[PDB]
């Protein structure tokens, strides 16, 4: 007879949703915010079993968007922090190079006790410093929506300079290659994209859609972007992403009604992470038996 | 408030740390890493392949059966332990 045997500490985990601790280097951020000291540890181990991954439904990003907004509200009334899980909790990352938001069958997945560095930027129509600047170009696609966000390669660097914005910053060779991969992106329905594409701006009406919003040491910038498509403080920018809502009504022509939501920018930074609660309980059958 | 944020995480860790140790330590084993129990394993045909098998995959294979095996522990512990009290009375 094989009797039930209980095992403690075996590897097993499930989904989770809890807040995370602080981890940051720089001090003097709202009276230290009661934040723990940061440990220099970016180690990652190799795991074989696949694990489901998501970028829109994961709860890790949902707390960042609320936390970052709360910090900005205190100003009304630039930091680099990190989240480290407590004991019994871990973070997973998909090291697959073909990640596009949905990787239910990740070939190689790593387990890390802490996430990476992230940047907070309240900006619209552009992707500021970011952290996923890499040599690979890929675009996230929602299954429950078309909503997309495009990552930009670091080779172009898309130099931007703003004063008082004057910039060429076209990189005509850069845009030609990337859009051809949006056709080669895992799904692209109709709209063959044969040398015809226009970045149609949102229709007139509400002021917010008409003009962008960018912050440079606390400046509500509202300028015109019509030219390209068709003492005094100074700042730069290194573009790394761009929000967009892809929509089409006919196969002959397509209109890109780009969105202007700020929450999606932070989701890209932590889009390859999920929080899992480790259950150290395990039950196995063994021939052993307890005395009396 | 960030103060409530930090406090919420800490209390959750202890709240979890004892809940599993509360579900455990009532079956009979307090902190022993591995220990045996008198409950027979149901459906011996479901013996796992010890060579090619992982803990993560097999645990979700028996998720439906977890709720049934755990209940039988309560009866086993109290019933067997209780009878020992009366046995020693005569001696």
């Amino acid at each position, epitope marked *: 007879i094989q009797y039930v045997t209980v095992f403690y500490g075996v590897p097993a985990w499930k989904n989770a949703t809890i807040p995370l601790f602080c981890a940051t280097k720089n001090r003097d951020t709202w009276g230290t915010t009661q934040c723990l000291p940061d440990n220099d540890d970016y180690s990652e181990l190799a795991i074989n079993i696949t694990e489901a991954f998501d970028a829109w439904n994961n709860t890790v990003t949902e707390q960042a968007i609320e936390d970052v907004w709360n910090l900005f509200e205190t100003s009304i009334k630039a930091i680099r922090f990190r989240y480290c899980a407590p004991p019994g909790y871990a973070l997973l990352r998909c090291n697959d190079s073909n990640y596009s938001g949905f990787a239910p069958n990740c070939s190689k997945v790593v387990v890390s006790s802490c996430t990476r560095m992230m940047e907070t930027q309240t900006s619209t129509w552009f992707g500021f410093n970011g952290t996923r600047a890499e040599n690979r170009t890929y675009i996230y696609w929602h299954g429950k929506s078309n909503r997309t966000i495009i990552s930009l390669n670091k080779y172009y660097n898309l130099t931007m300079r703003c004063r008082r914005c004057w910039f060429g910053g076209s990189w005509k060779e850069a845009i030609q290659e990337v859009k051809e991969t949006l056709v080669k992106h895992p799904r692209y329905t109709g709209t063959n994209d044969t040398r015809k594409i226009n970045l149609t701006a949102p229709a007139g009406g509400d002021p917010e859609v008409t003009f962008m919003w960018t912050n440079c040491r606390g400046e509500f910038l509202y300028c015109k972007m019509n030219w390209f498509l068709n003492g005094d403080l100074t700042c730069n920018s290194t573009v790394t992403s761009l929000i967009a809502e892809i929509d089409w009504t006919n196969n002959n022509e397509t209109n890109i009604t780009m969105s202007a939501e700020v929450a999606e920018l932070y989701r890209l930074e932590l889009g390859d992470y999920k929080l899992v609660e480790i259950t150290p309980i395990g039950l196995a059958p063994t021939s052993c038996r307890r005395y009396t | 408030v960030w103060g409530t944020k930090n406090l919420q995480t800490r209390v959750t860790a202890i709240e979890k740390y004892l809940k599993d140790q509360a579900q455990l330590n009532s079956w009979g084993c307090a902190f022993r890493q591995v220990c045996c129990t008198t409950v027979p*394993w149901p459906n011996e045909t479901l013996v796992p392949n010890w060579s090619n098998m992982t803990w993560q995959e097999w645990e979700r294979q028996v998720d439906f059966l977890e709720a049934n095996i755990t209940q039988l522990l309560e009866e086993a512990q109290i*019933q067997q332990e209780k009878n020992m009290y009366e046995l020693q009375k005569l001696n």
Partner: antibody
Amino acid sequence: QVQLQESGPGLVKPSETLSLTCAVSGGSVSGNWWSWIRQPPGKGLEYIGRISGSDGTTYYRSSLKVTISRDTSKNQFSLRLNSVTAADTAVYYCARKPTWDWFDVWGPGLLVTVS
Amino acid sequence: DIQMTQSPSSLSASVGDRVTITCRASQGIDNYLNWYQQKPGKAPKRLIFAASSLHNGVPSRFSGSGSGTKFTLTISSLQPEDLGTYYCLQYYSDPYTFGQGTKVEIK
């Protein structure tokens, strides 16, 4: 969960083939250990053989020289024996072999009779 | 081969009394025992298996125990439902040995 049913002739003369069928519904014959037991009207239970649906094990009693097939077909199995003896007549029951698992079911069975 | 000695097949008992049924083991079978109860003209149903492992259907009245050489079955109370024939089964070795059955008749 399961609704075991069976049927049989119920009238077998001595020295003819013995055929009895027990139907399996809601479960797979393979992967389950099955056995056949008969209840004599006066005597108690007696073990007469064992068979495994996995096909990896085959254990019979070396006193009755009897074999039982495990043809799946449509999830059914039956008993095969020839030259029935007078002492071998009894009420035949179909059920899985007793094991150390929570699940075990038995069929009502039917009586076999000889002249 | 081994021989099993069962309790007497004849039993007269009154309500509220304790009934003990035993079938002795010839050697250390290591609690591979099982029990069954067959009604007249009906199939048996498991009550207790593996010496001490409760099966759904009766809260506490049926409870066996014993290991090694000594084995016993203790019933706290007798009820109208408990009736028929009782058997104990062992499967440690290939040649099985069975009991004589108890033609229990209450009064």
